[PDB]
């Protein structure tokens, strides 16, 4: 019939009892890092299932014999951090010979290469059965412990190159089991009163600035302002990206000798101004997003042609192409401090990217509809993906797991934003409601109803006390976080509002179309 | 071309290849044939 | 409904049963409803709310469905109750009669700042500034020590920009009139320097009214 | 206690054969009707001194969607009349223009995937990008365009002229 | 005898350069040199002329057992290329 | 003109209040083409069915074949989860701060001149 | 870049602080092991090994699943007694045991017949290597989100007219019930700690080996 | 044994190499093609008179969606 | 307002019952190996009288389908010439001349003694050292399916495979490049 909430709750409790969950949300990173150490090695198994389960009577000495021939010849710069590695390998392989206990194979291995302190070697010579190892009270602890080596990444990269060659699976068994490696890359009451009064701000700190687009064809997708207020980028419907100057510098383009938009038929010879207008024609269909790198050094903009094409500001032409989702891309955004980036597509998933590879790294799946909004946490660790299935998820940039699921919206979600302090989350969409969610409790605490139309974008103030919600009904309302909590309602004299952004000094940038 | 509260079900969808085993787990038409026989005729 | 299916079924060549057209009509409604939903995603996301012909074509292209060709963009195809298209026109006069290649499509961006002269903000009538103005002008400057650090730190945190009166007064009255006196100008520079170290003060468009007095301090 | 104007902003300082062939067709209709009423009442080589041999050229004026469709309607109408037609419907013209518009979009889109694909490799299967795209479309080569033009424009015009000359002699003989 | 360079001059295009050039702008091309944008117009002419010539053949064998183009001369000519058009004539 | 009103109502039911008069006729043409094609698919199935009259099960198979190839939909809720599962073991590269946003290595970028053409 | 070294130095301070000294079955027992096996004899022999056998098997003798591996033209086997015979060269369980992942096939068998072993979702599988006498191998099979996504699927298959919103609410409660703690620090030093502690586990191979 | 993957490459292009990871994908492509054909053939088999046979004649009618024709008897 | 919007039908609800590989063997399915798969999949549908001609048709259909895939992939990396329309036969060298040369135009208009004709094709166009392309990686096949889209008309087969193709994309990063440089500076 009709499913009530109380029987849902007991079903969850029943499942917890089935899986023995009868038995913590903290902010300290010391214990989380301490925990991350615990479960990063708690039963590690990578080649354990694919172990070399072959007879191989004659593999150890021929393999280890190859180690000395390659690692001790024509190498001095990368040898000092790996020469000590050959010492415990003989001892560990000797124990592996004790485990399977051959008759003459173990004796031949020790006798032929006795040259590669002395007390450990002589103890292995006098012991040839596993029972003596258990009764020595010193070699038993040797097997139940690992030899840690603190080597550089280049030395490990040198090691990772050798281990992939032929006849190295047996040696890799010791590495995945026995050796753990490390990689290092007068009352004064008046002053009391003002401290309690001046802190609480009608701040009247709007300082609104408007950028206007004049009479053109009725097509415009997005417009982003550089964080340093040096450039202005916009995306058109007919695969047109135009860059404007906000400081009247009259920048000049540099020669590149390689162009992408030009055919350059075979009848050409390779032979080696103005500003305030420069068309960037690199895409095929409409451009749906445009983001910067927070340093005015590049330009990322996804398009409708299932591709992400990085734009360069040194050669001012298309440089890097990302053939990824193979599906139309909706939203694109950049991580703070220019580390990574991610985007959503029509396959109900969002994929994490990188600046060194042309293919996605992480896969985030579980949505029921196309992902239209995605953002990065200010610490670049968490992601929130919104869709039209009235759900808001929270993902992790490291493991790729959804820790929280937020529901309650009546329709699609068209705007997401992370608070600067990284402890609040905002969400809005077609329900004409502004919602605030707590990242710890996971429950809604405000019901904000100020707009009668769709909400486009959300942007938090640097002080994490004010927020501006751009809408399509020609109204830019700035509300107070720290419908009776509004600072100032802006009357719309234009067609619509595109983007609102706070950088510093409570500066308001509202972009619209005349 | 009608209007009603109920969602019009075509019942002739793209029928993506998937069979129901265990009522919660799904298979892409292969690679779970011999194992299912092995763990169903033995365990139960 | 169901009568429309029967009419075009007759034009196909054979009639259909009454128990078959109901399911066929339901299938048609589902496909058209899904097509509108697919066209909505391309529609409400770029920047627009108006239906266009190309948006429906794009939905068919990405759904492995043949695009409909034959309908333009202008409003045409009237109904006078019946789909007549017998407009026998000659192509001779339609070849070169009136042509013009002028497009006149240019883009221009301008910057203008709106207020939300004297927008009821210059005058101090908020009942929260006169008392604080008195304290900072006669108790934070001059004789009394051991008060600079606490007051300056509190002023560094709060921005409260938008009055534009007081900061100019101290600079004008402290430089153009206290230029021949000591024990005031040193602290006037100290409070001014802390103001430049406040990341929530908009001192962009106010460079001409402050630097000129700065050059007065270094003068003589 | 007043001040100067406080608003700083930067304001940019910115606010032949096809027609002739149709004329010959008109002359034949001018002669066919008279006959119908009378029957019942009885060294070059490419000089590399120019700007065309290189990629130097004047940019094409940008148009909009409304103006582009009208030119498509005009271009389609003229070439169909050159084929031997004199009247046609409106929807039939609209269907042909949309098919041509889709064909041009697919051909232009296919070229773009060809251009940016070789920009990352450096090696080309075919010596020309334009040679390649015809192969997936159906055109054998650019060298087949001269044969198509010769056998559908020059040969048609030479044939079309002879009919006019033959009918002119018929008019001179009858009258 | 003569190379293709001046033979390219001999052609008389019908579609203006502002139509083909706009197509390149949509796909992300400059369309600023005269020489590349003449084959696309010629290719477009060849594609339509073949259909036009095919429609002429159907029209001249209609009922012979002035020239008006109808759907009876369009849906069979478009059938070989894979174009399936079916428009109702009433309601 | 009874189809015009319901089509506008269908668009109204999806939150669209402004449209063009030509899309409504396009959907009517789409509906006509859809049924005409599926009726022809019923004819060939009925002709292959060695039956004089047209049965209703042939339509069910015919519409089944139309949805199999002529409509596109991503695999939901099960296949994308396997993709994340088979890629969950992929680690993350280390962060080495030199100048910030580095670029993919040389060759794997859209910077390469044609071999044939030269200076 | 000056912020990055500050985060790197802060990340280096955090990792050494959590490594040198520490700051009802799952969390409580591992905390006891940290308190017990933390002191060291000041020898360059660190004791952060797997040692899962001493944690539960030799000290509690709890139930476990034994997987048999028979080397050479014969395949592997699984027991509950009542062995099975399945050949190798199949990408069906070699990949599911290739990491800390819980294969779906076991979950179907663990819900109907047996009620023996439940450890907060994770299960322990023992691998036998007769020919490299058998060796002991105790590893943790951490469940993925596929189990909880399919968990509601059995619950949805109840013929009680389940709606989309009711399932979504059940999605959130199940995820929140087995949720993980989150770091809310806006500092970027967490990324360096997270990457270092997740690369030391998976530094082996992606494409090459 | 015979005709694993390399001789089919020689059947088209004498000088062409395939990467190690590409070979398995092609077999899975063939594996999915086999299942799709037999499932559709069985669906037509159950359609003749609720079930008749796996018939080579109805397979020819099935290949119209694949745009292929077998050179077989038919 | 929001209740009038429909919800997409889940294709996952409709599934088939299951009551009771040729992938890791690196083999094309032979006549004997396919027989076991047909009989086991026909029992669920209830079929009898297992014939032999149907098995052969399926095998040849697979052979033709795989040939189409390889023909599509090679055609995006090598040149070819068309004879009387759509027929591709060469799949080989650079016999195609450059159309911007007048010597090629007269040669095109024209169309012991056998060797000179081969020279007119193999030596009238190209570069001094024609470098071959790398072997087909996971990128070339991925782009080949995007452009053509005609080899596999079924969505149930084309879709499930294309995301597996995406997951198999790989290329060496900066770190591995020094190892190649170090090895190259060691043998010299």
Author numbering:
A (entry chain H): 2 to 24, 34 to 126, 133 to 201, 235 to 250, 253 to 323, 331 to 540, 552 to 583
B (entry chain L): 509 to 552
C (entry chain K): 13 to 93, 100 to 134, 145 to 248
D (entry chain I): 15 to 29, 61 to 87, 129 to 261
E (entry chain O): 116 to 180, 192 to 217
F (entry chain M): 13 to 131
G (entry chain D): 2 to 24, 35 to 91, 99 to 150, 158 to 234
H (entry chain R): 59 to 132
From the paper:
Evolutionarily conserved with yeast SAGA (Spt–Ada–Gcn5 acetyltransferase) complex, human SAGA (abbreviated as hSAGA) complex is a well-established transcription coactivator that regulates the transcription of numerous genes. Several distinct functional modules have been characterized for the 1.4-MDa SAGA complex, including a histone acetyltransferase (HAT) module and a histone deubiquitinase (DUB) module that establish histone modification signatures for transcription activation, the largest subunit TRRAP that directly interacts with transcription activators, the core module that serves as a structural scaffold, and the spliceosome U2 snRNP factors SF3B3 and SF3B51,2. Here we report the cryo-EM structure of endogenous hSAGA coactivator complex purified from HEK293 cells at an overall resolution of 3.7 Å. Human SAGA coactivator forms a rhomboid architecture, with the core module serving as a central hub for the assembly of TRRAP, SF3B3/5 and the DUB module into the complex.
The core module contains nine highly interconnected protein components, among which the histone-fold domains of TAF6L, TAF9, TAF10, TAF12, SUPT3H, SUPT7L, and TADA1 are assembled into an asymmetric histone octamer-like fold. The remainder of the core module, including TAF5L, SUPT20H and the HEAT repeat domain of TAF6L, exhibits an extended and curved organization and intimately contacts the octamer-like region. In the vicinity of the interface between SUPT20H and the octamer-like region, residues 509–552 of ATXN7 from the DUB module meanders through the core module and extends toward an extra EM density that is visible in low-resolution maps of hSAGA. Over the same surface of human TAF6L, an unassigned EM density was found at the similar position where yeast Ada3 is located, suggesting that the unassigned chain might be TADA3 from the HAT module of hSAGA. In contrast with the loose connection of Tra1 to the core module of yeast SAGA, the TRRAP module comes close to the octamer-like region of the core module and makes extensive contacts with the core module components, with a buried surface area of 5000 Å2. TRRAP is primarily tethered by discrete fragments of SUPT20H. Helix α11 of SUPT20H passes through a groove of the FAT domain of TRRAP, and then a C-terminal αβ structure of SUPT20H is snugly nested at the joint region of the three TRRAP domains, strengthening the SUPT20H–TRRAP association. Compared with the organization of Tra1 and Spt3 in yeast SAGA complex, human TRRAP is located away from the TBP-binding pocket of SUPT3H and no longer hinders the path of the TBP-bound DNA. The splicing factors SF3B3 and SF3B5 are associated with the core module of hSAGA complex through the concave surface of the HEAT repeat domain of TAF6L.
